[PDB]
Amino acid sequence: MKIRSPIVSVLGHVDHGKTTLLDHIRGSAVASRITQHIGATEIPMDVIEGICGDFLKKFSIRETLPGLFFIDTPGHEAFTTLRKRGGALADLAILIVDINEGFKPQTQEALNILRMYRTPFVVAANKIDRIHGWRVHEGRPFMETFSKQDIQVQQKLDTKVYELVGKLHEEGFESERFDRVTDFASQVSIIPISAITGEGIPELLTMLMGLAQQYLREQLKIEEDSPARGTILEVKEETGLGMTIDAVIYDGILRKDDTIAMMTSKDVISTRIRSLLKPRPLESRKKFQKVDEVVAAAGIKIVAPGIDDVMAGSPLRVVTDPEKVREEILSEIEDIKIDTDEAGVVVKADTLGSLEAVVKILRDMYVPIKVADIGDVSRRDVVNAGIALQEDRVYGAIIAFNVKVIPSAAQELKNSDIKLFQGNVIYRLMEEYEEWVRGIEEEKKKKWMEAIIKPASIRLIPKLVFRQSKPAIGGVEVLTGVIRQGYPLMNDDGETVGTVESMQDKGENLKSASRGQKVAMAIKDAVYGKTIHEGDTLYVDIPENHYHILKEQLLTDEELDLMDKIAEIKRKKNPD
Numbered sequence: 001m002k003i004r005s006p007i008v009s010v011l012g013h014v015d016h017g018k019t020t021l022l023d024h025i026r027g028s029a030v031a032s033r034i035t036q037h038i039g040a041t042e043i044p045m046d047v048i049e050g051i052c053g054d055f056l057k058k059f060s061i062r063e064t065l066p067g068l069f070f071i072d073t074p075g076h077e078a079f080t081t082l083r084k085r086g087g088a089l090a091d092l093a094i095l096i097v098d099i100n101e102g103f104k105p106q107t108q109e110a111l112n113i114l115r116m117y118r119t120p121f122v123v124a125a126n127k128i129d130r131i132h133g134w135r136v137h138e139g140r141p142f143m144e145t146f147s148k149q150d151i152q153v154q155q156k157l158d159t160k161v162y163e164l165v166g167k168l169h170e171e172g173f174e175s176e177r178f179d180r181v182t183d184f185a186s187q188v189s190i191i192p193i194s195a196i197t198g199e200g201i202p203e204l205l206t207m208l209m210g211l212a213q214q215y216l217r218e219q220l221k222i223e224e225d226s227p228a229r230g231t232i233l234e235v236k237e238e239t240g241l242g243m244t245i246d247a248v249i250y251d252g253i254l255r256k257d258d259t260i261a262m263m264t265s266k267d268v269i270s271t272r273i274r275s276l277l278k279p280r281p282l283e284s285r286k287k288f289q290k291v292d293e294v295v296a297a298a299g300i301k302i303v304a305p306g307i308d309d310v311m312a313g314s315p316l317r318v319v320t321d322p323e324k325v326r327e328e329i330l331s332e333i334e335d336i337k338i339d340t341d342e343a344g345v346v347v348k349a350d351t352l353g354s355l356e357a358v359v360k361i362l363r364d365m366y367v368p369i370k371v372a373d374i375g376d377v378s379r380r381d382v383v384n385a386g387i388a389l390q391e392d393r394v395y396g397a398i399i400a401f402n403v404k405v406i407p408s409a410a411q412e413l414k415n416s417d418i419k420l421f422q423g424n425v426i427y428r429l430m431e432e433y434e435e436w437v438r439g440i441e442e443e444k445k446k447k448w449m450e451a452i453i454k455p456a457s458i459r460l461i462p463k464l465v466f467r468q469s470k471p472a473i474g475g476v477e478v479l480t481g482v483i484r485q486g487y488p489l490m491n492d493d494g495e496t497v498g499t500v501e502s503m504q505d506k507g508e509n510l511k512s513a514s515r516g517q518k519v520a521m522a523i524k525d526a527v528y529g530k531t532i533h534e535g536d537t538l539y540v541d542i543p544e545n546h547y548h549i550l551k552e553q554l555l556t557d558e559e560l561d562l563m564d565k566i567a568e569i570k571r572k573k574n575p576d
């Protein structure tokens with residue numbers, strides 16, 4: 001057993017500086033007296049100590065770590081592909097943000113995933129050299145170069161830092177410029193830097209080491225002779241070689257003659273490795289260097305037969321026991337794909353990692369999942385959604401992340417009832433889904449409220465009697481509420497006097513009457529001069545069970561007052 005290098009991802013909105021930042025650290029390494037990796041950069045502890053001043057001396061873990069293994073983040077800003085059995089492949093992260101631009105959509109998306117997988121991170125407020133009036137002091141610690149700026153320049157920088165603090169706060173994260181942090185464990189540390197200039201990088205790396213000191217212990221233990229465990233980051237063609245796999249090994253050893261298992265779009269496969277390729281060491285004509293093996297804390301390119309359909313994000317396992325590896329990979333993938341008869345909600349994502357991100361977020365929002373898979377929305381996805389709609393329209397929806405819609409499914413989707421949420425920003429999709437369930441929720445109650453007998457009051461206008469009884473008919477004025485056709489009416493003493501049979505507003509047939517409308521009303525079972533009298537006030541005879549639904553669904557002010565009045569009336573022969 002040994003302690004490996006913490007794996008570090010660099011996340012952030014396009015053009016905010018992820019690449020430039022990595023190149024600068026790479027450069028400080030290149031300029032010294034280092035193993036090369038495919039898709040990653042290892043910065044040895046001695047290099048880190050050379051960049052960080054005596055500032056690093058406060059962190060004892062530096063004496064036990066080999067260095068920091070930076071991931072040169074995947075294809076097209078994927079980042080969720082940097083996955084591992086359970087959560088993130090990265091042990092730590094740097095969230096880069098342009099200090100002059102502020103938080104952008106991609107920035108918030110990364111922030112949500114970092115919180116989701118509880119990955120410790122630091123925030124690098126990049127491009128400080130672009131603040132008006134800034135005088136560059138090449139590769140110097142932030143504190144040193146900052147103290148040489150004009151006072152109004154120092155102030156402009158802090159204004160931008162506090163804007164970031166403001167944004168992180170709205171997002172549920174307390175934070176501060178790194179040197180003003182009071183609780184390192186609960187506040188995000190913000191390090192202002194210039195990736196192009198090198199300014200601030202020393203405190204940036206020092207804070208990363210601070211994150212390691214605070215959080216990383218057993219997660220870094222590796223068994224260097226155990227069968228390698230890794231994650232496939234890319235599956236791509238390479239000139240002269242066929243399909244190739246770029247992977248990061250996070251535990252164990254991978255040898256050039258090993259058999260490795262992985263997941264394809266259909267099943268678990270294994271392949272016997274032909275070559276392990278790493279970049280040329282620092283006038284060979286070869287683009288790569290062959291290697292016999294590699295030990296955890298490595299990025300490698302693998303050449304092996306039928307890997308065309310291997311999924312990016314798939315676990316990579318050296319095989320000892322064929323059945324155990326297969327079931328172990330299947331169980332992992334099983335919690336991400338999903339296809340059952342129960343629940344509802346159909347999810348489609350562009351990659352395994354993204355699908356996993358959506359599935360987890362949904363599971364946190366306690367939304368059941370019927371289908372979750374990779375690929376464009378299909379007719380089958382639509383049909384399955386329709387099936388789930390049957391037991392709550394809350395599930396009659398398809399959440400499609402960075403995926404297109406198959407024409408066949410487009411047509412199937414023609415008939416409504418099936419809501420389609422499309423987008424390349426996970427938090428927005430979840431935002432939209434909630435405000436969607438929101439409406440569906442209101443549209444539901446209002447619907448069952450229409451079936452509830454509400455409070456309403458009526459006054460029998462004197463001298464406007466058109467029929468004494470059988471259908472009793474007379475002029476009426478609605479006092480409070482909304483009297484409806486069918487409503488039961490009761491005496492001032494709770495005695496039932498009849499039901500509203502029909503109403504008419506001048507020449508209009510009304511099923512509902514409100515305010516002080518005054519209409520000719522027919523009251524079934526009532527008889528003038530006997531059970532009802534001119535001038536009387538009549539009240540809706542609200543049922544007990546219906547009355548109780550004052551709390552289970554609450555209604556004008558006058559209506560409220562009336563409800564109490566109606567309660568007082570009926571309480572004359574049965575309290576409550």
Ligand SMILES: Nc1nc2c(ncn2[C@@H]2O[C@H](COP(=O)(O)OP(=O)(O)O)[C@@H](O)[C@H]2O)c(=O)[nH]1
Nearest residue numbers: 014015016017018019020021126127194195196
């Ligand atoms: N002035 C300035 N430009 C920077 C800085 N960091 C990055 N850039 C520039 O911003 C552009 C995009 O950033 P880049 O690292 O290349 O790619 P990325 O992962 O999308 O961030 C490039 O033109 C960089 O040269 C910085 O600190 N200062």
